[PDB]
């Protein structure tokens, strides 16, 4: 996480670059795991956020019963959706997809 944050929040180096490519199979072992997103952290500028993706959830979300619900939700959004509700329905989808992720995880 730290090395990715260095290399991404400061690219265009000469200093880091030799160290950057030096011994990184960790990066190979940890690019199924780091999740990167983008937000606006009240400073009115886009600030990428790095975090953990649980190993009991890539299997839980790439399997069916949920992969089924994904396309249905994408269809109901892009089919018809106003320019404001987009995200509120998206987070409703997020919350009950958590609920289904939970009760499919107990199976």
């Amino acid at each position: 996480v730290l090395l990715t944050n260095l290399s991404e929040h400061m690219p265009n180096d000469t200093r880091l670059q030799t160290f950057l490519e030096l011994a990184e199979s960790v990066l190979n072992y940890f690019q199924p795991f780091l999740g990167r997103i983008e937000i606006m952290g009240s400073a009115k500028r886009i600030e990428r956020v790095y975090f953990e993706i649980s190993e009991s959830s890539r299997t839980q979300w790439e399997k069916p019963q949920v992969k089924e619900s994904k396309r249905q939700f994408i269809f109901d959004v892009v089919n018809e959706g106003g320019e404001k509700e987009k995200m509120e329905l998206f987070v409703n989808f997020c919350e009950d997809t958590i609920f289904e992720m939970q009760l499919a995880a107990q199976i």
């Binding site: 983008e38 952290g41 886009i46 975090f51 249905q72 919350e95 958590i98």
Partner: protein
């Protein structure tokens, strides 16, 4: 605990016995056409297990139907009961309909949801139990006494869930999909009682090959001009029947040559069913099943009558009925097309897509793979829920508070980080 193991097996294995039930009903009605008439009976062609394996496969079909609906009872029923609890609670909090609204005679769904607040275990999934006391003590001061009232209030005799379970049955029985599969079960039972109409289970091709939402697709694009247009066609044929009945009281002969006890169209009622059943299903027009106009002083009128009127009817009206129905399919295919294309050129979150984002090789591919990916928001919410409320970082707790506040402007609208650089 074997019942726990069994229901978890059915819920993990649910999307395969749909295919199995379709295959079984398909293979049964492959056989069911082998009948004749003696009272109805089945012949024997090649291999003498026709009757017993029909008996076996009807048994197996009905078992897999009941099997499947119990598997669906243990599956998505919590998801929809969850969504309904979430909607009820998040309209008690930010709106409080049972404080102020007491909603109108339409939208009876919330009116049925009125029957669930005085249970014991109201928000029983909802990831939660808490918001009941929060709402009914945040509003329970200048609407005090009644809400403070309605907040608190083997050997098992009456110590199970009563009103919530009745409400749950009420919400389950208003489903599309559950009611569909329950009708499918009852048709399995009555087709087990009478194997003639057992073939109604080829209607489950409505969820056929790569067309999983065809019920919503067919419900959506109903134009309802078509009902008004069929009404127009009926009015034109009825006007015609008025005219032909009120003048042409001899040119109809259902018999042959009049030596037989001839049949001249007279009954108005029949004259109308005749013109529908015959002239619409003619194709060549009503100028076929008619007296020939040779040698009559209404010959000119009847030729003008027939030619103009019924090519004006059948060509124009039946062609535009056909045009409405085919254009419905055209709208189906157009929306199925401009979901996929503008999703695959311009994403959700950026909402600008590969124009100034275009110049990077594999550009939009890298956008949706690394940058946002729409599950990293979901996995992010897993992460940002499952930690403690003291170990967030700055941005992390900030996003948590904006989520709890329901503000929704921390998603980057109109610009992303790669475009921000310049």
């Amino acid at each position: 605990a074997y019942q726990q193991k069994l229901l978890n097996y059915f819920a993990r294995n649910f999307y395969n016995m749909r295919m199995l039930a379709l295959f079984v009903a398909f293979a049964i009605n492959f056989i069911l056409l082998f009948y004749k008439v003696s009272v109805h009976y089945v012949l024997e062609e090649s291999s003498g297990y026709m009757e017993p394996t029909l008996r076996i496969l009807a048994i197996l079909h009905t078992v897999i139907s009941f099997f499947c609906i119990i598997g669906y009872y243990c599956l998505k029923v919590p998801l929809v009961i969850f969504k309904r609890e979430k909607e009820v609670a998040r309209k008690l909090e930010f709106d409080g309909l049972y404080i102020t609204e007491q909603p109108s005679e339409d939208d009876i769904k919330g009116q049925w949801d009125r029957l669930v607040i005085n249970t014991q275990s109201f928000p029983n999934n909802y990831w939660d139990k808490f918001v009941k006391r929060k709402v009914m003590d945040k509003y329970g001061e200048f609407y005090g006494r009644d809400r403070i009232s309605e907040l608190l209030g083997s050997a098992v005799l009456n110590s199970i869930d009563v009103k919530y379970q009745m409400w749950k049955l009420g919400v389950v029985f208003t489903d599309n999909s559950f009611l569909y599969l329950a009708w499918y079960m009852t048709m399995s039972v009555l087709g087990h009682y009478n194997n003639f109409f057992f073939a109604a289970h080829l209607l489950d091709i409505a969820m056929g090959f790569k067309t999983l939402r065809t019920i919503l697709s067919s419900v959506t694009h109903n134009g309802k001009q078509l009902v008004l247009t069929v009404g127009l066609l009926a009015v034109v044929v009825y006007l015609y029947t008025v005219v032909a009945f009120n003048f042409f009281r001899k040119f109809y002969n259902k018999s042959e040559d009049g030596d037989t006890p001839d049949m001249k169209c007279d009954d108005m009622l029949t004259c109308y069913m005749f013109h529908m059943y015959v002239g619409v299903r003619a194709g060549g027009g009503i100028g076929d099943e008619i007296e020939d106009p040779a040698g009559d002083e209404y010959e000119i009128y009847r030729i003008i009558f027939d030619i103009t009127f019924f090519f004006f009817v059948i060509v124009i009206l039946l062609a535009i009925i056909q045009g409405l129905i085919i254009d419905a399919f055209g709208e189906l295919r157009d929306q199925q097309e401009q979901v996929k294309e503008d999703m695959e050129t311009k994403c959700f979150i950026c909402g600008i897509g590969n124009d100034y984002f275009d110049t990077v090789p594999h550009g939009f591919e890298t956008h949706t793979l690394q940058e946002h990916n729409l599950a990293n928001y979901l996995f992010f919410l897993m992460y940002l829920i499952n930690k403690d409320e003291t170990e967030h970082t700055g941005q992390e707790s900030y996003v948590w508070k904006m989520y709890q506040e329901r503000c929704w402007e921390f998603f980057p609208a109109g610009d992303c980080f790669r475009k921000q650089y310049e």
